[PDB]
Structures are given as C-alpha cells and as structure tokens.
Amino acid sequence: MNIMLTLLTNVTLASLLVLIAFWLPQLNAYSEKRLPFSMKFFLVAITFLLFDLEIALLLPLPWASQTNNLKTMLTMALFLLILLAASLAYEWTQKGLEW
Amino acid sequence: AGRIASFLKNAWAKEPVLVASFAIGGLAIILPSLSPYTNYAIRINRATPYNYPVPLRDDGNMPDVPSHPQDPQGPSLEWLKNL
Amino acid sequence: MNPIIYTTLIMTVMSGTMLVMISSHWLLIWIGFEMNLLAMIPVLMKNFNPRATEAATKYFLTQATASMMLMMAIIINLLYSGQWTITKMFNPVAMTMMTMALAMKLGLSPFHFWVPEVTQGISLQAGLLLLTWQKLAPLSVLCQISQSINPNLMLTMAMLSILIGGWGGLNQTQLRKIMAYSSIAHMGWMTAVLPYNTTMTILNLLIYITMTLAMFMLLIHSSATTTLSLSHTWNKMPVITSLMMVTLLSMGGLPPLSGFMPKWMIIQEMTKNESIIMPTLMAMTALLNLYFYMRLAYSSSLTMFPSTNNMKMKWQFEHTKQMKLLPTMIVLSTLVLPMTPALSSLN
Amino acid sequence: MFMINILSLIIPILLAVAFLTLVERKVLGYMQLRKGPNVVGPYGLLQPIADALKLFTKEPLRPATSSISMFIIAPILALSLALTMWVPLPMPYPLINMNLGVLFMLAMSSLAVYSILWSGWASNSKYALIGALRAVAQTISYEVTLAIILLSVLLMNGSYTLSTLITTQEHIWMIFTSWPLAMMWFISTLAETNRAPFDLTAGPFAMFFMAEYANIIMMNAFTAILFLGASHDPHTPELYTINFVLKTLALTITFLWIRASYPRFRYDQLMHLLWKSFLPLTLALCMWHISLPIMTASIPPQS
Amino acid sequence: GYSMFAVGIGTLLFGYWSMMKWNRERRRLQIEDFEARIALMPLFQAEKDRRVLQMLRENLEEEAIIMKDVPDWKVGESVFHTTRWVTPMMGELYGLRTNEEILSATYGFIWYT
Amino acid sequence: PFFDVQKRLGLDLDRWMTIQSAEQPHKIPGRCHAFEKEWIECAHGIGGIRAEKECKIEFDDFVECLLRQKTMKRLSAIKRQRDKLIKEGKYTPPPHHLGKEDPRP
Amino acid sequence: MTMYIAFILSTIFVIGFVGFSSKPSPIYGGLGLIVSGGVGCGIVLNFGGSFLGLMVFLIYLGGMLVVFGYTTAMATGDWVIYDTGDSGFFSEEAMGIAALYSYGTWLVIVTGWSLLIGVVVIMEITRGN
Amino acid sequence: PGIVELPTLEDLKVQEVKVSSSVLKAAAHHYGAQCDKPNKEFMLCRWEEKDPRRCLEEGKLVNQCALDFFRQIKRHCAEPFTEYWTCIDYSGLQLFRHCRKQQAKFDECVLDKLGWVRPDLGELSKVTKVKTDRPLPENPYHSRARPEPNPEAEGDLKPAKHGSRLFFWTM
Amino acid sequence: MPLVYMNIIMAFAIALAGLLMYRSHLMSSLLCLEGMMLSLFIMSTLIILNTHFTLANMMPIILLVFAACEAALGLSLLVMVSNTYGTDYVQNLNLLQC
Ligand SMILES: CCCCCCCCCCCCCCCCC[C@@H](O)O[C@H](CO[C@H](O)CCCCCCCCCCCCCCC)COP(=O)(O)OCC[N+](C)(C)C
Ligand SMILES: CCCCCCCCCCCCCCCCC[C@@H](O)O[C@H](CO[C@H](O)CCCCCCCCCCCCCCC)COP(=O)(O)OCC[N+](C)(C)C
Ligand SMILES: CCCCCCCC/C=C\CCCCCCCC(=O)OC[C@H](COP(=O)(O)OCCN)OC(=O)CCCCCCC/C=C\CCCCCCCC
Ligand SMILES: CCCCCCCC/C=C\CCCCCCCC(=O)O[C@H](COC(=O)CCCCCCC/C=C/CCCCCCCC)COP(=O)(O)OCCN
C-alpha cells in the first residue's frame, strides 16, 4: 500500500512534469517548418546474461552462512565461484573478449 | 624452482592484477581448512536458537536433562562469552 | 571443432540422458532434458552450413516447446498432489500434457514433421546420434509412468506414427529422410506396447538401435546420402552393398532375420490382451517400410547401376578410418533370432 | 501523513539536482583557474532557475517521424526510477522499510537501461542506435561487477537490509574492512552513471539530465551508507542525517574532481578494463569475503 | 612500493579484527533476543489457541443461526474423514467478519513497510 | 529405464526434495505435513495398485488439505445464504462480525 | 475487500499475454512481455514471495528481456487459501532458498556444469566459419 | 464426516495479561526464570496432544502464573521496572543494548526484593524435562489401522519347469 | 483451485498458442516461449509458497536460470540465421522439407 502509493506518486509527478514541459512551448506559435550487425555486441550481451544467471545463484549467500553445515556450504560457494572464473577464463582464452 | 621463480617474476610484472586475483582465490580456498576458528563458527551457529526448545517428558531415567535452565546440567555458553 | 570440446559436448549429452535415467525427482529429469538439449545443438552444427543451422534451430524450437510443456505437466501434477517423485501422475490433464511433451520429444506423429527435416539438414554422424541416443530418455520416462498413460491416446499416436512413416518413406530419394521415416515407424511400433509390456518396448528399442547403428555406419563407410550415390558402391565395395542389403532385409522384419524379433514379440504380447485388430493393421502398414527398403536394395546390390570413369582412381585407395563395432552391429542386427528367449533378462 | 513524507523526499532531491548543476559548474571553473557562473544571482544561485525556465520555454524538437509513445515514455521511466531509488535508503529512518532493500535498489538499477534502449531506438538514426548500444553494453557490463561487489560486501552485514548497515558500522567504517572492493565499486558507479572518464555518450532533455544527476547523488549516498557508516544515536537522528549528507556531498564533489582531472577511455579500453581487471579481482575477493567470516568466526547475526 | 602494500594489508587486518569482535558481540546480543522470545512464547501460544477457538465458536454460532432453513445442511460438519484436529484456514476465521480486518489479517505484514 | 543408482549406492542425490514431510531446514512444518505423513505411512510397501485402492481416505484428506475445495464450497454456501437473508432483511450480523467487538490479545 | 487485487493483477497478466501473443512489431511484443513480467512480479510480491519476486524483477527483466531488446534493436477467491500461524523470527522463503547449498549440493553441481557448458556452446555456435 | 467439537465461550474466558510487548520484553528473562514450570507443562502438552482443545487448563495456569509474576513486580519495585520498560518501548527494534543502565537498576531491585537472579546466556534455550502426570496420548494422529502388507513369499529356487516355454524353444 | 491459478494457466495457454501461430519474426516465437516460462515461474512460486514447502523454494530460481540459459542459445541461433538472410523471418527456413 505504501510502496504502491509511492510508485504511483513518482510516476504521476514524472508524467505531469514531462507533459507540462512538452506543452508549455506549444501554446505560442513558432515557425514549425543500417545493416552491419557487428557480432561482438551480441556476444557481450550474452556474456552478461550468462554471468547474470550465475549471480542469481549466489544471491542467497548472505543467508547461506547460517546452516551448521559450514564446510559443505563453503565448498559449494567456492565451487560456484570457481566455475564462474572458469567461464571467464574460457571466454578469455578463446578470443571472446576482444574488439 | 628456478623456472617457477622466473615465471612468477615475469607474471608479477605486466600482469599484477591476475597474480593478485589468483593469490587471493588460492588463499580463500586453502586457509579455511587450516583455521582453528571454523569449528568455533559452527558452534556459534549451533547455539543460535531459532525455535522453541520443546521439553521432554520426564520418565525417571534422564539425569543429564535439566529440570530448570538454572540447573548446572545442560549445555553452557561460557566459551561464547569468553570469545 | 576442437576434439576436446567435441568430447566434452558428447559426454554432456550422455550425462543429461543419464541424469534423466537415474533421478527420482521431476525437477532433475527436466534438468537432464535441458542439459541434453543444450549440449546437442553444437553437435548438429559441427559442420557449418545454412542447412545445418536451419536444422538446429528447428530442433531447438521443437525441443524447447516440449520442455515447457513437460514442466507445465510437472507443475500441474504438483498442484493436484504435492509430489515430486516420478510415478503415477494422479491428474488426468497432467498426464496428457506429459504424453504430448514426450511424443514431441520422441518425434511421434502428429509431432513427426521435424524429424525428416532435421535429419536431412545435419550430417550422417549427427543423424546417427539423433536417431539412436536421443530416444533413450523420453522412452525411459514413458516406461516409468506407463501405468498412468491413457491407452487410447498412446495407441492412436503409435498407429499414426506407423502409418505416417510407412507412407512418407515411399516418396523419398534421400537416404537420411528414409532413415527418419523408418525411425518414426519404429517409434510407433515401440509406443504401442508400452501400455502392456515395457520389456517389449526396451527389446524393440535395442533391436532398432542395433539396426540403425549398422545402417548409418554402412552409409558413412560408403559415403552416400542419395540413392544414386549409393548405386555406385558396388563398383568399389560390393561386400558393403551385400551387407547393406542383408541389413535392409532385417530392418523390414523378414524372418529369420533379427528385425522379425520385436514385431513378432509385440504382436504376441498384444494378443495376450485381446487386441487383435491393431497388430494386424500394424503389420499391414509395416509392409510399406518393407517396400521402400526393397526398392533401396534393388537400386544398391541386386542390380548393377552405371558408373563413371573417375571411379577407377577410387579403386587405388582404401579407407583410413574404420568402425570397430560395425561387424558386431551387422551380426547382432541380422543373426540373433535364435537367442530370443534371452529377452527374459529384462534388457 | 505518508504523502507529505513522499513530497518531502521527492521535492528536495530535485532541488538538490538543480543546485548540483551550479555546484559542478563552479567547482570545475575554480579548478580551471577561472570562476563559474557568478552573475545570474548573488553568487550564481539563480542560474539553475534561469536554465530551467529557458529549457521549459524553448521549442521541443520532436523528430516528427519517431515513435511518439517511447519518445515520451523514456524520460518518464528515467525520472520514475531515479526518484524511486531514494525510497529504500535510510537517513537514518527510511521512508519505506524493506527487508531486501539492497536487492530492490539493484533491480531498479537493472531497469534503468530501458530508457537508454528506447531513446536510442526512437531517434530513427543508425548512429544514435549505435551509441545507445554502446551505452547499454557498458551499463550491463559494469552492473555485473556492481552486483558481485555488493554481495561480497553484504556478506559482512548479515542481510540485505539497508538499516543494518548502520549497526554493522557502529564502531568502524566498512572502508577499512574492504578498501579494494570499495575502489572497484567507486569506479563501477562512475561507469554505471556514464560519468567521466566513462562519458562516451528542451523538456525531455532536461528530464533525462535530472534523472542522471539524481542517480549520481543517489549512488554517492548509497556508497556513503555502504562504506562510511555514520554513528546513529536514537534520541537525535539529526546528527546522523548531517553526517550522511556531508559524506554524500564529498563523494559527489569527488565525481566532479575526477571529471576535471582525467581524459576519457575508449569503448574497447573500458570493456577490457572491466572484463579483464575488475571481474577477476572481484571474483577473487568474493571468494575471500565468503571464506573470511568462517575462518575468523565472525559471521554476522541475522538469518 | 613495499610500504604501500604493507599499509593496505595492515589496515585490512585491523578492520578484520575489529569486525570479528563486533560480530561476535552481535551474535551474543541476537542470542539474548532469541532467549527473550523463547521465554515469552508459551503465553503467546496460549492466547493464540484461545483466540482461534473463540473465533471458531462464534462462526459456528452464526452458522447455526443462518443455516436453519437449508434442508440437508449439518451445522459444524467437517470436510475431512479424520477426527484429528486440523489447523483452521484463514477464510474459516474471518469469513463472516468485516472487510477491513480481513484485509488486515491477510496483507498487514506484507504491506507494512 | 530407471536405474536406481541412489538406492544401490546410498547416495540420496534428490530424495530430500520429493515430499513435504522430509527434514525441512529449521524444522519448518509444511501446511499439509500431517496429511502427507499419514498417506505415506498408509501406502508404504503396499504397492501402487493396492495403495490407490486402499489408502483412498488418507489421500482424499491430503488432497483436501492441499486445495481446500470442499472448505471453499462450504464457506461460499454460508456466505451466499447469509447474503440472501440480509437482502431479504430477516437476518442481522452481530457486533462481533461488524468490528464492534472487544478484541483479545 | 479491495475488489480482489490479486484477481485484477492476474487479469492484467492475462491481458498482457494476449497483448504480446498477437506478436505485433516485436518491440511492442517485448514491451508487452515487460509489462506482464512486472505484473507477475507484483502478484508474487503481494503473495509474500519477496525474494522470488525480486529475482523475477531483477534477473528476468533487467537481464534477459534487456538482452532480447538489445538483439531486436540490433536487427531491423483470494485471501482464503492463506495460513494462520507465523514463521518465527525468520522468513521461510529465504531459509528454503538459502538451504540449496546445505541441502541442494546436487542441484548446484548440475546447474553450474550446465551454465559452463552453455557458455562453451554459445561461443561455439557463434564462432561462425 | 462428523461434527467438529469446540469449547464453549465460557471455557475460553480467562483473566488476561493486558500489558504491552515492551513490558513483556523488559520482564522476559525473569519471567522465564520464575514462571518456567507451568510454561513447560503447557508446551509439552501442546506438542504431545497436537490439539488446542486439549491444552486449555494449562493455558489458564500459565496466564495465572504470569499474572502472579507481574503482581509481584508491581508490589515491590514498580518504579524501577517502569523506567526500564520506558527505554525498551522507545526503541523501534526494542534492543536490550540501548538501555543497559535501566536494566541494571531493575536487576538490583528484584534481587533484594525477591532474590531473583537473571538467567545467563544459553540457559532459557535449554531443553528441559517436565514431571507431568498427564498420560501420553497413545494415538495422537488419530490414524487408522495400517493395511496388511503383501505376503512376502519365501522359498528355495528351482530351475524353470521345461525351460522358458517360449514358442518352440526347448530350453 | 482458485481463480488465480486458472488465470496463470490460461496465460500459459495463450503464450503457447501464440508460439504455435507463427505469423513471422522468430523473435516473436522466442518471446512466446519466454512468456510461457514466466507463467510457469509464477504458478510454481504460488503453489510452493501456499503449501509452505520450504525446500522447493530453490526450484523456481533454478527453473529461471535453466530457461534463461535456453533463451541465450535461441538468441544465438536467431542471430546466425539472420547472418544468412539479413532477416529473422520464419518463411526463410524452408530449405529442409518433408
Ligand atoms: C562415487 C562415484 C564417483 C564417480 C562418479 C562421479 C559422477 C559425476 C561427478 C559429480 C557427482 C558428485 C557426487 C556428489 C553428490 C552430493 C551429495 C553427497 O556428496 O553429500 C554431500 C556432501 O557435499 C560435499 O560438499 C561434497 C563436495 C563435492 C562437490 C565439489 C566438486 C564437485 C565436482 C563434480 C563435477 C562438477 C563439474 C566438473 C568439475 C571438474 C552432502 O553433504 P552433507 O551436508 O553432509 O549432507 C546434507 C544433508 N544434511 C543437510 C541433512 C546434513
Ligand atoms: C541386438 C543385440 C543387443 C545386445 C545389447 C548390447 C550387448 C553389450 C552389452 C555389454 C554388457 C551388458 C551388461 C551390463 C552389466 C550390468 C547389468 C545391470 O547393470 O543391469 C541389470 C539388467 O541388465 C540388463 O537388463 C541385461 C542386458 C542384456 C540384454 C540382452 C537381451 C536382448 C534380447 C535377446 C537378443 C539376443 C542378444 C544376445 C546376443 C549378443 C539390472 O537392471 P535393473 O537396474 O534391475 O533395471 C533396469 C531395467 N528395467 C528397468 C527394464 C527393469
Ligand atoms: C569510496 C572509496 C573510493 C576509493 C577510490 C577513489 C578514487 C580515487 C581517484 C582515482 C580514480 C579515478 C578513476 C579513473 C579510472 C581508474 C581505473 C583504473 O585505471 O584501474 C585500472 C587498474 C589496472 O589496470 P591497467 O593499469 O590499465 O592494466 C591492466 C592490464 N595489464 O585496475 C586495477 O588495478 C583494479 C585494482 C583495484 C584495487 C585492488 C588492489 C588490491 C590488491 C591487493 C589486495 C590484497 C587483499 C587480499 C586479502 C589479504 C590477505 C592476505
Ligand atoms: C586456486 C584459485 C583459483 C581461483 C582464483 C581465481 C579467481 C579469478 C581469477 C581467474 C579469472 C580468469 C583468468 C583467465 C586467465 C587468462 C589470462 C590470459 O590469457 O592473459 C594473457 C596473459 O596473462 C598471463 O600471463 C596468464 C596468467 C599469468 C599468471 C597470473 C597469475 C598466476 C598465479 C600467480 C600466483 C599463484 C599463487 C600465488 C603465488 C605467489 C606467491 C604467493 C594474455 O593477456 P591479453 O590481455 O589477452 O593480451 C596481452 C598481450 N598483448
């Protein structure tokens, strides 16, 4: 209720200000007179996406540290980070991060 | 030995970021297996009561189970306090 | 590609299939399917050409739609009973969603349209992999939940698959499309006995995999993808054409060849359940598969087609690379009928 | 009286942006051995008002063939996100108290690229689209390391609650526990807002400008709360408010200083900077900050 | 060169030690809060049971009043075969009550920020 | 088909996640945990056919707890009859259900 | 009742799906899917799934609809089923999500292997030649 | 299937503890130290019976004991307690650390007046035993009788009679 | 099964039908799979939260991840097809036929 109302107020103020900005100078009359598709940008977007997926898994790490199984949790967190590093290394050594 | 030293000296020049990152990651992997405070962290996590401790029905054969928290028998947290 | 990357992708495909086969949680089965699909695409695109890219994108679209349908079935089954274990479904709607997803993954009619095009687009080794290894996981899942399936729907799709394979193979000159339609017909034969006996399903699967491996390795050895290209093999390797003719006779279900073992057994099983009309129609329709196998045999080994002059140069060279298991595959696909009772091993 | 609180949060932020324009001009001028605007107003104080009035009166040049819907929506989304990301922040008491406030801020930042994408696509020009693609690629690339650094730092806070950061830093600042992560975070926040040396790119133009400067102030305040923990006494929150505002102002002036001090990167050079220097160190320090509380038996409380 | 790295490592170690002490103190304080909650729990459980039972009885009385004209209705009839007590559903307690407190019991914790 | 590697090796790769009543973290209890436990204990080792035909009571209760369809039907019937009576005017809600009661802790 | 806010949210979800299912001008379909994702996030958050709703809204929207838009630009009854008790001094969703490392070792292993294989597969597919 | 039995409104009437959560948190440690026995009786009965309708008298007992505890507080040191709770009530998180001095004054007053020692860290979270004379419920889940298991046949294997007996095969 | 579940199910059905239409623009096909997975995530999250099944709180995220990985591959495929034709039209993929 509070968050929805705050969002509505923010959007309403932004809309009001943009429309008044777009219509204040409209009252007075004036004169009123390709293909390339480079492959590297798609690859950086996909790398960001793959990395983003890895980011979600860790997200729970702050809570994962209270389990009484600290050894297993530490091992799996380090495994996830090592595999993220391995993805970065593989894309590095295969000329995936070049321009 | 000598070749490893040459490789490390050649990498420490012109690639210091990678050397630092690999050293820090290797330490993060190795050191936890040797620290004596990891078991202390496990014990601290065990001592955090999230749930109500459900009492057990007394049957006349439970000497190690306290009848009151003030009783000497039962787990203590003096190691936690001294930490 | 790099041989290391190729081996990694092949083992990832096998590990996905294995994950599907050994798990008891529906989420893990879905994950195994996802892993298999993810690692399968570069194998189909190992040799780069527009046709292979088209085949891979069609295969991906089909398999991803099937995976989404399968996850929908899993979630509905969880909704009507908070269970994650692969067992009887407990929901009529969920079972249908699951059956259609697995039929789309297998290529059963009326979800067969992708198989001929994907097989034609990809190379011969990719086609061997696609038509042999990619049927294990969906069929294993079907076997695990066979007590849930509606027999009407499964039998309808099985008969439709047999009819479609038989009719579609009659119109083909390309060898890969012939293999695809043959695989569709054999899948139809396999899924018609799931409601009654999963052991017969597994026996049919094993026999079909053996024959398909033999036929694909023979087609790779004599590097032909069309009828007329295969018609030149007698002028270099007549023994290969003879072995191919015997294998084609086996694939048509003629006794005393190995290919007679499944249908016979399946028919026999279906008779124990007071099902008479359906096996009769299945055999009559398998006569079509036999017809186009026989046409291939006529064009390949039973008659001598004209050759070209450059073939003489090919007379001076021998294959550098060989398949170790090709003789064993041929023998197992032609001469194992006397060992039929060994099916009690619950293969 | 929640609406009054919302207005008292929103209006002062826009006024602060308006006068941050003047502050930046005057700071750059005095760093360049000259004066800034000192004529419009007693000390240049009327300059932002004059700029706003001139911009709001000048003709808006709509491309006359561009997508009207997105051409209006992009500044709306920019302003909405810039004003929304102030809600989560605790100064000391937050307007809205969120359990996962940090995650909410990250999600808003992730959305912020849609305005760039839509404004670039609407302009109906190949060159503008190329520039927008550059900007989007840089923004997503650097938000990766922003997220990883953020979770590595929060592994010492105990949760995603922004108020708990005040409790975590009651004795010492988080800058001393992890300065390298703070350095990389500062550079990534520079890159995220497209500020120099990473600045490779009527009404709606002013709207975008306001959104960008609001994000600048917001990011600096977030850094101040995250790494320079001000002491908070529950019976006098004005001390915390003043201290936090001073630290935010110092960080904003540091952005101005960095703008006035350095040349700018190439696109490939900043891509390489990130993907080959920050991400490896960020992953290594993420492993280190996962392991450290367990090694030292210093795991934060909440679970 | 060496001095700058030494300064960085030294301040890192100082921060690590300080936060070790502070985080252990925070763990002890959290354990104290949890102990207070544990001590207070039985009274809250008794009040919760008694409140739920009162709401159920009031709903039963209103159902007895309302359902007097329905032919095949049985007042207070369970839908489970088991005689075991089942935790009441949220619609069972606030079904006949006013909208404001229904929205309260449903979304008060979710919407409270 | 199903190769039960976990049972042969005693691994427990994914069985921890299959049912509601299997050792949740912090001993958190599932809403339908009591119903599922009874259904499982009824049907253990009996086999699928006999479980489906003989443990129908427990599964029906478990399903009801999970979806609460019959409770919805009963509550809707009560509300609809109350609405009919209040539209006719021969029934009046008590102060408890109008928010005029005395709340208890 | 607030006229069944969950129901109207689900209705807006269905309307948005109808909106982008016609597939007009794939940028417009993408924007319709973005609106649908925001509405679904609102549904999950209003239900009580704060972390999962924010995961939708961050990962889904800010990463992958963003990548879809990037690639496209490069080219040419409620309130009733709910509970009665409380959770304690923690959120059950966070603990269950948090439990994957302690409980879900197998899930972590298979997911990480799948993601590494996915990186390799993407690079190999886009290699060209 | 059956009628759900509920206690009457008179059965649920009890002299209620009408103090706020700040007062309760201020008193919680000594309350747990002093009023422990009825509380453990109630909670053991509550996890054993799994039924609110079977635990009402123990709830009345815990309410009475809490009322007695607060009457003792009121009689001997009302002022020290009031100052301490004022501090707890002010804080939004109700932290114990914020007002240590108030707590110390309260602790001294109770010990002299009632000889009460505040429980240490790790004591109120102990699992203790309860001497109760209430019988243990023999079927708390109200389960039915488990269905009879399958026969579980046993014997000594012999070769299949006349082999597989599959069509024309003699083995 | 209340009205919210049926709304999410019909949303999934609408997305599936839209995918099966194929007017043009394979990007729209990917978008339809994407809406399908989003509906799956929403309904699985609702089911798991309602029943308080604590552990399966993992599986929505996992689902997302895996589906998202799938999306990446699809995009790659789309891109490569465009590299052959200059457009992602569905009707250009008719080289292979039954
Ligand atoms: C034995 C057969 C070996 C050959 C076959 C290998 C098959 C492929 C390899 C992957 C399978 C590895 C098996 C691990 C299964 C996990 C379950 C088991 O190991 O126990 C876990 C132990 O986890 C340990 O951390 C094992 C660590 C192993 C994972 C790290 C590296 C794994 C890499 C394997 C392949 C990944 C990609 C390739 C990398 C090169 C659980 O620990 P615990 O907490 O007590 O129990 C939880 C239940 N509680 C909550 C009630 C207490
Ligand atoms: C056409 C010829 C096909 C031949 C097949 C390939 C031959 C090479 C195989 C190499 C040796 C295989 C043996 C495997 C070693 C261990 C076996 C163990 O792991 O599996 C057991 C069982 O192993 C297999 O069942 C036995 C395989 C034997 C196949 C032969 C029968 C084929 C029909 C007769 C045709 C003639 C073939 C003989 C000539 C070579 C237990 O299985 P179980 O976990 O409990 O349940 C899974 C099966 N269910 C689901 C159906 C119940
Ligand atoms: C809130 C606090 C803010 C702190 C930062 C304030 C900024 C001060 C003003 C300067 C910033 C101006 C911004 C301009 C951008 C500058 C970015 C930059 O150039 O960094 C690049 C730079 C190097 O790149 P290149 O020189 O181009 O060569 C690499 C290829 N061979 O990248 C980096 O080095 C990043 C490193 C960040 C700091 C990390 C250093 C830590 C190393 C040792 C730490 C050890 C701790 C481990 C645990 C200890 C256990 C024993
Ligand atoms: C066991 C710990 C593992 C986890 C820690 C790692 C986490 C994150 C770090 C890894 C990220 C991915 C790394 C990918 C490696 C690729 C490097 C590379 O290819 O760069 C080479 C050059 O870099 C190299 O030389 C390869 C690595 C060099 C060695 C780096 C450090 C290795 C280990 C050193 C310390 C080991 C442990 C401590 C020893 C010191 C004493 C304590 C070429 O550079 P370009 O930019 O492409 O072009 C420049 C030429 N024009």
Atom 13 (ligand 4) nearest CA: A89
Is the C-beta atom of B29 inside 6 A of ligand 4? yes
Tell me which ligand sits closest to the C-alpha of residue D283: 4
Measured CA to CA, the distance from residue D52 to residue D208 in angstroms comes to 13
| Cα distance between residue C95 and residue C98, in whole Å | 5
Cβ-Cβ contacts under 8 Å, G113 against chain C: 12, 15, 35
Q: Please check whether residue C304 is in contact with residue C232, taking contact to mean a CB–CB distance below 8 angstroms.
A: no
Alpha helices, DSSP H only, in E1-113?
A: 2-66, 90-93, 99-111
User: CA A59 to CA B3: how far, in whole Å?
Assistant: 41
Residues of E in contact with F34 (CB under 8 A): 84, 86
Secondary structure of residue C197 in the 3-state scheme: coil
CA distance D203 to D225: 33
Q: Is residue A99 part of a domain?
A: no
- Minimal Cα distance from F28: which residue of B? B51
Pick from G76, G68, D113, C54: which is nearest to I35 by CA? G68
CB D124 within 8 A of CB D60: no
Buried b (16+ CB within 10 A) or exposed e, I1-40: ebebbebbbbbbbbbbebbeeeebbbbbbbbbbbbbbbbb
Closest alpha carbon within chain F to H150: F46
Is B20 a pocket residue for ligand 3 (Cβ < 6 Å)?
Answer: yes
CA D85, chain centre distance (Å)? 9
Residues 57-116 of D with CB under 8 A from E: 96-98
DSSP B36: T
- Cα–Cα–Cα angle for C280, C285, C288, rounded to 5 degrees: 145
Q: A62 in a domain, yes or no?
A: yes
Asked if residue G65 lies in contact with residue G37, where contact means CB atoms within 8 angstroms, the answer is: yes
Residue with the smallest CA separation from ligand 3 atom 43 is B20
What separation in Å is there between the alpha carbon of C183 and the centre of ligand 2? 22
Residues 45-104 of E with CB under 8 A from B: none
CB-based contact D106 G58, cutoff 8 Å: yes
Which residues does chain B have within 8 Å of residue A67's beta carbon, measured at their own beta carbons? 45
The angle subtended at Cα D103 by Cα D97 and Cα D105, nearest 5°, is 75
Residue type, F97: H
HEC string for E50-72: HHHHHHHHHHHHHHHHHHHHCCC
DSSP-derived 3-state class of residue F98 = helix
Method: cryo-EM
Type of residue found at G50: S
Chain E contact for F82 (CB, 8 A cutoff): yes
Residue A64: closest CA among G97, C340, E86: G97
Residue C49 vs residues D15, G49, I91: alpha-carbon distances, Å: 60, 47, 18
**What whole-number distance in Å separates Cα of residue H69 and Cα of residue E88?**
33
Q: Whose CA is nearest to atom 8 of ligand 4?
A: D280
Q: How far apart are CA C275 and CA C196, in angstroms?
A: 11
Cβ pair D295:B31 closer than 8 A:
yes
Q: What value, to the nearest 5°, has the Cα angle with vertex C30 and ends C26 and C36?
A: 145
Residue to mutate (ligand 1; options F3, F13, F15, F24; most atoms within 8 A of CB): F13
Whether chain D lies against chain A with 3 or more Cβ pairs closer than 8 A is yes
- Contact B52/D at CB under 8 A: no
β-strand pairing of H129-130 with B56-57: parallel
What CATH number corresponds to the domain at position A55?
Answer: 1.20.58.1610
Q: Are I59 and I48 in contact (CB under 8 A)?
A: yes
Burial of D41 (0-12, 13-18, 19+ CB in 10 A): middle
Taking the C-alpha atoms of residue H81 and residue H100, their distance in angstroms, rounded to an integer, is 13
Domain regions of chain I by residue span: 3-85
CATH code (residue G75): 1.20.120.1200
Radius of gyration from C-alpha coordinates of chain E: 28
C-alpha–C-alpha distance, residues F9 and F4, integer Å: 9
Instruction: List CB contacts of A83: < 8 A, sequence separation 6 or more.
Output: A54, G112, G113, G115, G116
Cβ of D180 under 8 Å from any chain B Cβ? no
Nearest 5°: CA angle at H69, between H68 and H75? Answer: 85
* Residue G58 DSSP one-character state: I
- Under a CB-based contact definition with an 8 Å cutoff, are residues G93 and G50 in contact? yes
Please, how many CA atoms are within 13 Å of residue C22, restricted to the half-sphere of its CB?
17
- Ligand 2 centre from C104 Cα, in Å? 27
- Ligand 3: residue of B12, B17, B31 to mutate (most ligand atoms within 8 A of CB) is B17
Whether A47 is in a domain gets the answer yes
CB within 8 Å of F24: residues ≥ 6 apart: F30, G96, I54, I55
Q: How buried is H151 (Cβ within 10 angstroms: 0-12 exposed, 13-18 middle, 19+ buried)? A: exposed
Interface of A with G in 24-83 (CB under 8 A): 37, 39, 41-43, 45-50, 52-57, 59-60, 63-64, 66-67, 69, 72-73, 76-77, 79-80, 83
DSSP H helices, chain I, are 3-21, 26-50, 58-85
The CA distance from D257 to D201, in Å, is: 19
In DSSP terms, which residues pair with B57 in a beta bridge? Answer: H130
User: Quick check: D134 and D111 in contact, CB under 8 A?
Assistant: no
Q: Give the SS3 label for residue D114.
A: helix
Residues 6+ away with beta carbon under 8 Å from A49: G63, G64, G67, I68, I71, I72
Closest approach atom of ligand 4 to CA B28: 2
Resolution, Å (one decimal): 2.7
CA H34, H36, H41: angle at the middle one, nearest 5? 150
Q: Cα torsion at D265, D270, D273, D279 (round to 10°)? A: 150
User: Closest-CA residue in chain A for E111?
Assistant: A1
Q: What's the token pair of residue C118?
A: 């994907």
Query: Which residues precede a break in chain F, with C-to-N distance above 2.5 Å?
Result: none
Smallest CA–CA separation between F52 and chain I, in Å?
A: 22
D276 interfaces chain A, CB cutoff of 8 Å: yes
Task: Give the total number of structural domains in chain G.
Answer: 1
Closest ligand to the CA of C139: 2
Range of the domain at A75: 1-94
Residue D223 CB less than 6 A away from ligand 3: yes
Structure tokens that stand for F31 in this block: 């809403």
Helix, strand, or coil (residue D236): coil
Whether the CB-CB separation of C12 and G117 falls below 8 Å is answered with yes
D30: how many CB neighbours lie within 10 A of its CB?
12
Q: How many independent structural domains does chain A possess? A: 1
- Two structure tokens written together for D135: 């900007």
Q: How far is the CA of F9 from the centre of ligand 1 (A)?
A: 13
Tell me the C-alpha distance between D244 and D220, whole Å: 10
Instruction: Enumerate the β-bridge partners of residue E77.
Output: H3
Cβ-Cβ contacts under 8 Å for I37 (sequence gap 6 or more)? C68, I63, I64, I67
- As a 3-state breakdown, chain C gives helix, strand, coil percent values, each rounded to 5, of 75, 0, 25
Burial class (CB in 10 A: 0-12, 13-18, 19+), H100: exposed
What letters, b where the CB count within 10 A reaches 16 and e where it falls short, cover E71-93? eeeeebebbbbbebbbebbbbbb
Containing domain of residue G23, as a range?
Answer: 5-127
Domain covering I3-85 assigned CATH 1.10.287.3510 in the classification: yes
Contact C54, C118 (CB under 8 A): no
Residues H158, H162, H166, CA angle at the centre, nearest 5°? 115
Which of E107, E111, E112 to mutate to probe the G interface, most G CBs <10 Å? E107
- Structure token digits, residue H89: 């009530």
Give the whole-angstrom CA distance, residue G64 versus residue G69: 8
- Using a CB-CB cut-off of 8 Å, the residues of chain A touching I83 are 37
D276 three-state secondary structure: helix
Determine contact, residues C101/C69, Cβ cutoff 8 Å: yes
Residues 6+ apart with CB under 8 A from A44: D137, D141, D271
Residues of B within 8 A of D281 (CB-CB) are 17, 20-21, 24
- Judge contact between B25 and B18, C-beta under 8 A: no
